[PDB]
């Protein structure tokens, strides 16, 4: 007991951030605005993605509860004692800490920042059944309302600053892109290429920011059958001549995700594979033209489906054509509202940042067996969209003969 | 629709696994037993850690729903189209795939594998409120019971095979350790050290298995104020002579976590800092002796707390003395039932794998400012506990001069 349960130790000074004070305030005020309309007294964010969007700080889980409370006048994050003052140095607003000594210390903190609320917003899509039960025990008369979906929609529109940062990530995506290409050789293990590439981006990232946290940045370099799944982990498989390859760059900068995904081939490509590769590339080019303000997600997916249908490749499609960007990674975020999927009528609006990544996968034993995929990032504007991915795609440039 | 919604396509052949068929069957039958005694018809696992423990396969989230169903006769994993046949190649048992074409495709998948069930077990500590209502919308008269807690308790005990794998991780933790040490030097940026270390471990893992997926393995190398938080990310800060440093190794092998954490100093260490470091190491040696079968987690903590209370350092403790190992990582898992915290009365039994990692944090400006910590893993046996961490700890060895 004589041990501190909830105290605020602000160690060190606020760290650099790419986002301006106005940008961070804009976000926090967007919420207060939504609260005011839905009669909410305070909002309790708990996911990686929301806390990062609204505070600028990205937390490390390891089984502990984390959060951020926002009412009309304040904005506070709730980190654990294991994080010292890093969460305070990195978040826009205030920070408070709780310890492991008592099992309810976290709730004791949310309670302190929630004094008086009647209706509180929590993320219905991140809060578990257990967490909800413990929250009701901690906040007796509070009615919980969802803020998860509302944030998601508000996040689909990127500001110029977010836009600025994503543009910067795309650049690094190309730097990595160049490093993979240079590493490709018959005989080299996949993991060696990944190491070469990730190192390239980490160093590049470390160099372009006065201050920055090198985190989660990774590479997915797949060869042969490993290419049958877009998220397949790097393995120790040896790359062979002729193998179909998949270059995937994911540099994570201040929580924001950007990627570069390109199909490649070692030494040479066979007719069957070349055949499918070009057809997929053709769909890609068409996809890049369909991204425009006012277009419905499904319409885009329906039109592209046709081209595949002609070459009877439709049944080999692996996943949706594109998703929203911003604050997400492989283990958090992603605005489900914007998905280039057949039954999503969501309209594309200026400010959104979607991707075009057509992929088909052919089975083992089949000619051209493997996964084919190109991935570009487009910023939607008032009367068009800007493709910000520089790396070349297609047979004309990606048959690596090093 | 001329497009497949739920189909199973097993592209490739079952990959190698460190676990035997007996080991995996054991885990799946532990559930089947619990279900039988609690009258459950089927279990729907949905978390990273549970699907990995029971199927051996670690999925990639990226916003999609994943699962594994287990009734009395079958064991099937549910993966997305974007994953191709990788989920099948790594799953112990059957595998089914669903597509993005329709929003409920995943649900008709679980629906198919759950026919006739009245009581279904889900993970209440992982299922969101949103996920929960959708499951109720898809499985009408079905009653949901928690299976997360039951699994957590069953996983606290590690089999020999798991113990084997964990010993291999620890060995790799030591290689990372040597690599970090070799890279420490006034003038070098933190991330350069991190890269050297991670590269060393990834290469060492790729070399130890006929087949292995190189995933998530990472290093946290902290210097100066960045040592105030144990999970503080790598930054681009240049290391200076006399800086306190934290070496942290986390190799991820087939989803299993192991760790090596050691306090280090560059060139020299001041008297103030050497002072705190020696006492922390003292709390460490004592902690290693207190880990034995029969001990209650809370008793170990109360006993070590008294040591810190002697030197008036108790107020600087950052977090719990130790946790349980197994299928965990920074973004998933962790058996909450075994925490070396003040209010946890769990009795350590043979077969558990716990850590001993005392830490103290001194604020900026104070003498000795910084975060001090050591981390050893111990495999509890019938009559004692084996320390499998080999890298040295203490001032006698970690005042890096190079």
TrEMBL record, chains A, B:
Q: Which residues form the Peptidase M24 domain?
A: 165-382
Every copy of the Creatinase N-terminal domain together lies at 27-157
Pfam families, per the entry: Creatinase_N (PF01321), Peptidase_M24 (PF00557)
- InterPro entries tied to this protein: Creatin/AminoP/Spt16_N, Creatinase/aminopeptidase-like, Creatinase_C, Creatinase_N, Pept_M24, Peptidase_M24B
Organism superkingdom = Bacteria
**Which is an annotated GO molecular function term of this record?**
creatinase activity
Q: PANTHER family in the record, alphabetically?
A: AMINOPEPTIDASE (PTHR46112), XAA-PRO AMINOPEPTIDASE P-RELATED (PTHR46112:SF2)
Name of protein: Hydrolase
User: What organism is this sequence from?
Assistant: Actinobacillus
Name the lineage.
Bacteria, Pseudomonadati, Pseudomonadota, Gammaproteobacteria, Pasteurellales
């Amino acid at each position: 007991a004589a041990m501190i349960x909830t105290x605020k130790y602000h160690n060190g000074x606020k760290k650099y951030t790419p986002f301006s004070x106005a940008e961070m305030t804009r976000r926090x005020x967007r919420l207060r605005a939504w609260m005011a309309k839905s009669x909410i007294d305070a909002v309790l964010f708990t996911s990686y993605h929301n806390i990062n969007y609204y505070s600028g700080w990205l937390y490390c889980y390891f089984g502990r509860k984390y959060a951020x409370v926002i009412x009309x006048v304040k904005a506070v994050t709730i980190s654990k004692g294991i994080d010292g003052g890093m969460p305070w140095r990195r978040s826009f607003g205030x920070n408070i800490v709780y310890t492991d000594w008592k099992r309810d210390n976290f709730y004791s903190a949310v309670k302190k920042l929630v004094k008086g609320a009647k209706x509180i917003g929590i993320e219905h899509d991140h809060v578990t059944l257990x967490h909800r039960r413990x929250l009701x025990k901690a906040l007796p008369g509070t009615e919980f309302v969802d803020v998860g979906x509302p944030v998601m929609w508000x996040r689909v529109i990127k500001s110029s600053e977010e836009x600025x940062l994503i543009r910067x990530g795309a650049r690094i995506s190309d730097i990595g892109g160049a490093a993979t290409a240079a590493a490709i050789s018959a005989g080299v293990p996949e993991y060696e290429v990944a190491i070469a590439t990730t190192x390239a981006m980490v160093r590049x990232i470390a160099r372009x920011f006065p201050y920055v946290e090198l985190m989660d940045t990774w590479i997915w370099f797949q060869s042969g059958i490993n290419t049958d799944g877009a998220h397949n982990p790097v393995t120790x498989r040896v790359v062979x001549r002729g193998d179909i390859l998949s270059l995937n760059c994911f540099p994570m900068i201040f929580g924001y995700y950007t990627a570069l995904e390109r199909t490649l081939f070692l030494x040479x490509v066979x007719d069957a594979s070349l055949x499918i590769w070009x057809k997929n590339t053709a769909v890609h080019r068409r996809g890049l033209x369909l991204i425009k303000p006012g277009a419905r997600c499904k319409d885009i997916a329906s039109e592209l489906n046709x081209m595949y249908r002609x070459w009877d490749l439709l049944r080999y499609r692996t996943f949706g054509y594109g998703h929203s960007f911003g604050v997400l990674x492989h283990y958090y975020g992603r605005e489900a509202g914007v998905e280039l999927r057949e039954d999503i009528x969501t309209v594309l609006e200026p400010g959104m940042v979607v991707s075009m990544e057509p992929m088909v996968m052919x089975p083992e034993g089949e000619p051209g067996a493997g996964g084919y995929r190109e991935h570009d990032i487009l910023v939607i504007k008032e009367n068009x969209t800007e493709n910000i991915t520089g790396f070349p795609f297609g047979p004309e440039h990606n048959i690596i003969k090093a």
